[PDB]
Design a protein around this nucleic acid. Structure first.
Lengths: 106, 79, 93, 98, 93, 107, 79, 98
DNA sequence: ATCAATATCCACCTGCAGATACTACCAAAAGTGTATTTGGAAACTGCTCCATCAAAAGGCATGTTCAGCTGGATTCCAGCTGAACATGCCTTTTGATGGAGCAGTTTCCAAATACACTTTTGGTAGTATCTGCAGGTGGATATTGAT
DNA sequence: ATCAATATCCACCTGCAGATACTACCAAAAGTGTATTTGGAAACTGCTCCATCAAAAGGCATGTTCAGCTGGAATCCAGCTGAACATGCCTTTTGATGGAGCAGTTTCCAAATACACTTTTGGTAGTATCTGCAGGTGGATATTGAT
């Protein structure tokens, strides 16, 4: 008896997700492609941030991802930055950015 | 007092992270008050969630749920 | 028992960056991130069903949901990844 | 006698702080503030280190961004110095006040 | 058949202002108001109940919702009419 | 047989509201006093607004409440205005307001 | 090219309700650009609801549901 | 002849329009715009009068609401003439861009 | 254009805080097989209402001219805000540390669910006759701008 | 102040769109009654982590002097934008045809729920080792700012 996450070819728990959709009270019933579909979507999005965040770390001379890295990954991507526009990442700081008119008169 | 405990130096640091280069003298008193209102609005709901759960301790979750409905979602404290 | 996507995150991490590690706090943020998107999607789906007088939350409902919730390119791919897993799962006993 | 032109260090402080992620407000004073405010909604309450930690992380985040948009307002006024009214305008346009 | 809260709003209308009418256009806006608030409150209640592993939405749930959602003075008065009503309803059966 | 609304001494339908909670899918179960309380607040709220709209209508010599009246009532009240600040009322218009600095001359 | 159907006279009227006393020359195109974007965003969501319903007609509820998603809730058309 | 000084009519107009509730954009021009834009997303669509009407109620509600924030930005700049960068500072602070 | 003061970067290093790991333990979770049940896709179709067209008309958009006054460029100077120290007051560490109260587990009873039946009702469909007020009108009062 | 041109106001009023009034029909809704099931309060309590101390260290906030430079003020003037005018288009209003497609209803099977039994797994705990990197030392060099 192989698991559904395997059948769908995924890491995320198709089973845990299904259980959460029921106990979550979103509807009287829940199809089966749903927990699968939804599960796949969560995974993809996870990979998408972790990917960028790795980058952020590598290009920072580090191998261990930390909040700063997730913050730079998100705030530097138009798509993701919109998805989490009203979200605050603890310990992420802000993107280095100084308004031009405030730079030494030069 | 306590809101007065939030020092000028800290507010200058905050502003700096924000990119501010010159800070008017009248900014500090104005800031503390904006901050006080934030906290009051947020704690007020954190406390309400607490009471609803029959506890005497405000839990990190209580604050996260509070921030969530103020539209100030915060990641990194469970849930 | 305290559930957490923290270990499936770790697995995803490795296919992407095997020699990359992740800090505890960072893993926490990531869990908070998965739970957020989960809820945001499920919720929009819940709604769709109700608007259409439907008791069932199907992948049809999850797809439209992802479309309404995710920005341009992100949604495109999220949909493909989604249609893929549902298909590979239906065509396999 | 060495001395930096006004605005040189500030600009240096900006770069330094947009690089770090540490909380910029002092912990003990912050906790006092929170505990006191809370007293107003319910006598004798206890707080998880993490519940206060969360609170601080959210309000510092909040202030920073308000300072960002406030700065934008000053600049629009063709100034460089943020002032009370710059915060007023920013908050009033965000829907936090009027 | 489509349900509305119109006949009820009107009842309340004649209570506060005995000689005032209401255009269907405004009755429509009131109907959206009642439903909006219904959804907002029941929602908070729904969620309030989850954060406590509870499966029942009681008057206690509905009461926290009203406090969390409604602004100061409105909430104070809303909580009363609410209890007063429950209490009265309790003492009869 | 008395309707649950009367038992509660209310105009709003305790029965209908109770029905919508189940269909709304907000939880496994729904206690008997949930709908009672909720309908109670729903009434108070519509009374509070209709009260203010009724007055708005009077201040304009009208006797029938239209949308502009609902708008005046909500925007002039600090609390209702906060509860409906992200809400737009069709055919309502806006509050008469003209930034001082735009008014002619001086004195 | 109907975006030019938002005549200069109309935009000036909208601004008067906004309480604006004097309008710059360039505000007319800036505004049409803002309206096009607001509309484009709402219709997308509205049409997404229509398609999902397997309908060919964008109903008033669809627009209303779309608006509530943008945090721009409307009253007067079935919610 | 007789003519009002520049600015008098404008006020007459503000007072006027702020006192009314009718839609300020021509109906037909607006519909062709909605139909045009929807089509560029899905062909063969149909609209209920009221669906077209809801969008206009919203659209105007949004722009009127925007001109005000804009107007405040002008004043903050000690001006009384709204310009494009005024509309932009407003939309940026509102969280609609940058 | 030169030169002194500093800040800043970078390469290397070391230690411990926290990430990594081997192993066992088990309650809850997830897969499986079976019998009952039902949501909602189909297909036929009634009927609502949307797209369209014809038409008259006058409201309102357009394009122009003209000059009022606003915005932009510019100079200027008093004083506020930044930089740099001098100074000591208080936040921070951290280890201990009782003890409040959060969270686990057993109990059992008020209360919710499920189900069968009767009864009251809000919504609608059919007509039919009121009525608040929009919009036209005339004329007395009020605002504005030229003098 | 005087005053002529317009806008503002308001009483006055008529037409009709929209609100109000009845009569019916009734399918779904809401009430009543009974048996059956259970969620969650209540009382007990182990142990997790919160409020408090002790307690020097020195980090860092505060008071102060000084002058750089910015914000606010005062001037000026080209031209942008508002007002008024002419003119004629296209939107609004009215009205009705034809039919697309939304929505009601009955038929009914593919997928979902409800259980019960069976096997897997992720979270909790110890208990032990290992590693990325924060923080510290130099020494080089870029940056700043006075000449």
């Amino acid at each position: 008896a192989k698991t559904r996450s395997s059948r769908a070819g995924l890491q995320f728990p198709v089973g845990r997700v299904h259980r959460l959709l029921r106990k979550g009270n979103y509807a009287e019933r829940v199809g089966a492609g749903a927990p699968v579909y939804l599960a796949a979507v969560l995974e993809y999005l996870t990979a998408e941030i972790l990917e960028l965040a790795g980058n952020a770390a590598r290009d920072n001379k580090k191998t261990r991802i930390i909040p700063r890295h997730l913050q730079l990954a998100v705030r530097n991507d138009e798509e993701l930055n919109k998805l989490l526009g009203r979200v605050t990442i603890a310990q992420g700081g802000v993107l280095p950015n100084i308004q031009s008119v405030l730079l030494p008169k030069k | 007092d306590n809101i007065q405990g939030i020092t000028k130096p800290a507010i200058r640091r905050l502003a700096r992270r924000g990119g501010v280069k010159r800070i008017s003298g009248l900014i500090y008193e104005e800031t503390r008050g904006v901050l006080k209102v934030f906290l009051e609005n947020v704690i007020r709901d954190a406390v309400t969630y607490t009471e609803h759960a029959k506890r005497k301790t405000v839990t990190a979750m209580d604050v996260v749920y509070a921030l969530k409905r103020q539209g100030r979602t915060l990641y990194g404290f469970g849930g | 028992r305290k559930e957490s996507y923290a270990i499936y995150v770790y697995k995803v991490l490795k296919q992407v960056h095997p020699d990359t590690g992740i800090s505890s706090k960072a893993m926490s943020i990531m869990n908070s991130f998965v739970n957020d998107v989960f809820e945001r999607i499920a919720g929009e789906a819940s709604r769709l069903a109700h608007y259409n007088k439907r008791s069932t939350i199907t992948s049809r409902e999850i797809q439209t949901a992802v479309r309404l919730l995710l920005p341009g390119e992100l949604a495109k791919h999220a949909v493909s990844e989604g249609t893929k897993a549902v298909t590979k799962y239906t065509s396999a006993k | 006698p060495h001395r930096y032109r006004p605005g040189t260090v500030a600009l240096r402080e900006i770069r330094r702080y947009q690089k770090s992620t540490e909380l910029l407000i002092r912990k003990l004073p912050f906790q006092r503030l929170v505990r006191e405010i809370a007293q107003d909604f319910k006598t004798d309450l206890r707080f998880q280190s993490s519940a206060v930690m969360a609170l601080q992380e959210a309000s510092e985040a909040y202030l920073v961004a308000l300072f960002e948009d406030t700065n934008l307002c000053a600049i629009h006024a063709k100034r460089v110095t943020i002032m009370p009214k710059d915060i007023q305008l920013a908050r009033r346009i965000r829907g936090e006040r009027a």
